[PDB]
Amino acid sequence: PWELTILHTNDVHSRLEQTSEDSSKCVDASRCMGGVARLFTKVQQIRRAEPNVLLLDAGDQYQGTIWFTVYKGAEVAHFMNALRYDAMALGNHEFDNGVEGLIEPLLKEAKFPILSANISASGPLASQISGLYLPYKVLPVGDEVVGIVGYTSKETPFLSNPGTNLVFEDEITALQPEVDKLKTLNVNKIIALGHSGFEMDKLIAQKVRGVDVVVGGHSNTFLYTGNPPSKEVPAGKYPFIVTSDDGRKVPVVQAYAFGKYLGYLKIEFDERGNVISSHGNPILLDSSIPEDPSIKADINKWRIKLDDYSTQELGKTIVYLDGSSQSCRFRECNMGNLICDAMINNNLRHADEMFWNHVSMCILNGGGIRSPIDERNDGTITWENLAAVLPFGGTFDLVQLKGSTLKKAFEHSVHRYGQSTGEFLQVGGIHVVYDLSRKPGDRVVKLDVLCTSCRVPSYDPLKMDEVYKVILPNFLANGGDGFQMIKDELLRHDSGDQDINVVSTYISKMKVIYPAVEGRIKFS
Amino acid sequence: PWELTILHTNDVHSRLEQTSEDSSKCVDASRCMGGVARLFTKVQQIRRAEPNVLLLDAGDQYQGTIWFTVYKGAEVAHFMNALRYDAMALGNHEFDNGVEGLIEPLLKEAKFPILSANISASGPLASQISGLYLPYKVLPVGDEVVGIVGYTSKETPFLSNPGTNLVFEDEITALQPEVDKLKTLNVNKIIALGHSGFEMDKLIAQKVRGVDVVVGGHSNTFLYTGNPPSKEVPAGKYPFIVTSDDGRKVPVVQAYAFGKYLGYLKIEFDERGNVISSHGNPILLDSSIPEDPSIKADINKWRIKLDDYSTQELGKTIVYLDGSSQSCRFRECNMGNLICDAMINNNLRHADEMFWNHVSMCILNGGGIRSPIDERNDGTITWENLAAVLPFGGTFDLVQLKGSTLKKAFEHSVHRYGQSTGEFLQVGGIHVVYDLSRKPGDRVVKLDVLCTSCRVPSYDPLKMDEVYKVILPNFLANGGDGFQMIKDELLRHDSGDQDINVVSTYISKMKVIYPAVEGRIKFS
Ligand SMILES: O=c1ccn([C@@H]2O[C@H](COP(=O)(O)O)[C@@H](O)[C@H]2O)c(=O)[nH]1
Ligand SMILES: O=c1ccn([C@@H]2O[C@H](COP(=O)(O)O)[C@@H](O)[C@H]2O)c(=O)[nH]1
Ligand SMILES: [Ca+2]
Ligand SMILES: [Ca+2]
Ligand SMILES: [Zn+2]
Ligand SMILES: [Zn+2]
Ligand SMILES: [Zn+2]
Numbered sequence A, B: 001p002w003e004l005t006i007l008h009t010n011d012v013h014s015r016l017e018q019t020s021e022d023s024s025k026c027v028d029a030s031r032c033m034g035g036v037a038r039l040f041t042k043v044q045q046i047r048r049a050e051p052n053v054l055l056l057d058a059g060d061q062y063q064g065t066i067w068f069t070v071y072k073g074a075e076v077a078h079f080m081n082a083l084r085y086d087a088m089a090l091g092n093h094e095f096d097n098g099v100e101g102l103i104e105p106l107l108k109e110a111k112f113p114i115l116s117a118n119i120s121a122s123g124p125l126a127s128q129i130s131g132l133y134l135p136y137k138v139l140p141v142g143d144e145v146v147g148i149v150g151y152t153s154k155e156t157p158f159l160s161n162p163g164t165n166l167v168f169e170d171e172i173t174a175l176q177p178e179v180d181k182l183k184t185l186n187v188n189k190i191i192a193l194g195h196s197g198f199e200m201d202k203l204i205a206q207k208v209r210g211v212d213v214v215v216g217g218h219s220n221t222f223l224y225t226g227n228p229p230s231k232e233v234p235a236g237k238y239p240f241i242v243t244s245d246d247g248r249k250v251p252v253v254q255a256y257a258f259g260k261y262l263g264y265l266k267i268e269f270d271e272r273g274n275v276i277s278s279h280g281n282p283i284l285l286d287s288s289i290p291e292d293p294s295i296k297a298d299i300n301k302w303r304i305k306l307d308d309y310s311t312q313e314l315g316k317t318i319v320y321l322d323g324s325s326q327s328c329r330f331r332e333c334n335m336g337n338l339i340c341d342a343m344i345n346n347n348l349r350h351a352d353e354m355f356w357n358h359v360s361m362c363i364l365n366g367g368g369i370r371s372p373i374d375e376r377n378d379g380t381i382t383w384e385n386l387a388a389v390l391p392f393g394g395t396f397d398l399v400q401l402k403g404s405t406l407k408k409a410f411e412h413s414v415h416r417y418g419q420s421t422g423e424f425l426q427v428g429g430i431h432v433v434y435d436l437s438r439k440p441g442d443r444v445v446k447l448d449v450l451c452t453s454c455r456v457p458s459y460d461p462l463k464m465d466e467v468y469k470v471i472l473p474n475f476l477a478n479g480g481d482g483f484q485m486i487k488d489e490l491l492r493h494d495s496g497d498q499d500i501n502v503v504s505t506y507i508s509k510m511k512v513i514y515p516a517v518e519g520r521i522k523f524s
């Protein structure tokens, strides 16, 4: 039997530096985790020990920290090249800076193949990008070869900025003929590496005949066999075994997100490329693993430009940006309006003739707004100022919520009003009126929402059975601040852009801001 | 006696081409008026006939048509040089593109002196601009000399974009010592040429000892002695005689605006430089005066770049821009919101710690919105599209209105609601609620306005005795659509930027627009 060790990362999301346990900024270095310097140490150790190793990334290195803001993917090519990745699949966030922001910095500078079998280009773009990503690559591993076939979420146009000259095909439709072709070329060991989420990964394992292993991402899925090593709660065993339509057992793996874990799967293959066994577990990259000194020194050199950028003017405000708790936990506050307006702007994506934009609505818990910004520094706003407002290292995500669920969220917003608690909601594209003389659970007396399926945006009453797209913090999508109804009833969730970055981009675009309090939230 | 002919223009406001009688686009060429080619013909005729002639401009050549949008003052230097102007005073609109947009295109390219005695610079700007405008110039005229002393509205910081490195001093305070100095240098014939408005021109004539003549502007004042030749109604005789504190009669002149008239004043002086007599009248530049063929051919060559610019993309919309009458004469319409938001953005000026901005409020009659803009041309918006929405050649002006006057305007807005009449108001920085079941004059049931003297903009009830700054079309400042209360009760009026240009700049800055209908106007 021929044994392969697959090492894999996914959804690293710009966590170049080691992090806290929750993947936010490292404070107590002695307890920090992840980062590329520590990953280097562990990969190097494994490569000393195991003869046949592939290091794979299932996408979404782009977007998540000031590294991406400043270096725009150059840091991804540089540090993935230093780690000697063998292959990477395109994730949705690889399109955040458009096709141009993918071709240049990443496709042209990577020393490993970048893969996606279900993305096609037309017009002059097709000639410009031809060969810079591939449907698959056949890699030599010891005296054998292994085919790696990529895929990317069909939903990328709604979750990033790929433009109108790329088409994202159904994954299984695109993958099958490529896997069929590799069989005709005497490639009998095939890994599907891609970025569509755990549910689609299981469908690929089931339906794409000849796939031996699926290495996925996008959904930040943590899988584990045994007692888990940290705070993440497993969604299933590692690997997750799918029974394929051809009767084979097909392992499916993912490794959470944020570079906290290194996925590690050992596969035994017979002479015909059938999987005989698979076993492993992600490895928690905790402080017991030293940061590689050479990688750490290069990280510290690259950090200088981040420190310099952090104090640069992004734009100006001519108004006080009231992020005080005394405002934002009690009533509409202009910082809340700014952040929600930035959230909606960030989610302007290419539209049908069927909608002006696919999403129009935003909620933001006031407890998530952690500082005001004074306008009397010549109006200057810096990244450092925004990091004081939004210090948690979160994202502004896209969810689908029934109106009934959103009504329950607005009732929860004021269930115990008057205590300065964090659940009070700031809004965009929503007008709410409360009557606090009513019983908890029955205080929302008006709730109107901005249309999407309309050529002129206007407000309509919220409908209980209609499903609305809403931009909101990951903290709330995960049921933080008591919003259990959001976690338990949402129909879709996709992780979005870094919270600070969303607001910084909006302020940079606007140049001079003057958000008002305007009656999005009223009391009767 | 030594006789001087003073020819003068003011507030030409980018009317390079001949115009309709109302100074808008020329349609019936046989009845058109003004323009620089016709002015050239008349000035040339007068210079053949009169030995001692000065051609003066009292400011505000900048701003008013697509000429200024495209050529940014190069057209002003070019065509004023072709007409051989002798001197120009700085107007407020000469600062519309900042100091940089005055130095380059106009101060560096004019072949005549540009004057203002009451503008001072500090810091590096003082060295950069030194000598490029002057407090005064002494000009040879035949065998004599005439001093010309300039001035500019002290209010320019509220009416343009001069920046924070220029100080506009009180006109009379600045002028007196310069006029005193010219007396010490044996200059006994002195013209004050400047841009502060007819009321300040009369105060200068009264109070600045040694001024022989005041040639003014800014207020678009039409003066005439006799039966007037066109639609403009005189504010007084031409010249308007002021009795000075020293006991002299001091003529004050102005010549309307828009290049429709050439001011013409004949002055007789004694040997000591005292005015013995003054007489004249503006000359209506009607179609009986031929356009100079050479100037007209140069105008037609410069027009090519305007035609090319007119069809260029300024920005995009992802929403239908509903400028229909069926919307904008009946209810809040998103085109109205866009235009009012552009109006407020245009009027962001440097602020005290006393206000976030000096003005926060906008009204716009729905009858002034003449087309929608379809978003299905790949979202493109062009100047030509905006000219269909705003076809009248107006400006968006700054007025001061008591709350009582603004309440009466909102009652007038709906006095005969339901007939598709033009007076229905679109708004910005104002939230109004009507009850149309009430009697005409008593239909406004709520009227809230955005604060200015506040660090966080928020809405307060309108106060009847408080004076509010409001941006609105010149058509409404002049009492159009039955808004007689605005004309008759306003406390201040200053002419603003060209209507199309205001919206074009805003769309260019925003890049992608998506204005909503959001409850600025409601019905109960
Ligand atoms: O990741 C986080 C953690 C807390 N929070 C907010 O912080 C609040 C706690 O703030 P406080 O203890 O300082 O009152 C909590 O109620 C939330 O609203 C977030 O928004 N995101
Ligand atoms: O300079 C002008 C002339 C008319 N108008 C508007 O045009 C309206 C007349 O339009 P109508 O005749 O097409 O109904 C008038 O009631 C005003 O609202 C302006 O706004 N500006
Ligand atoms: Ca196989
Ligand atoms: Ca004199
Ligand atoms: Zn991701
Ligand atoms: Zn993803
Ligand atoms: Zn003017």
Ligand SMILES: [Zn+2]
Pocket (backbone or CB within 6 Å): B060, B091, B092, B093, B195, B217, B218, B219
């Ligand atoms: Zn003026």
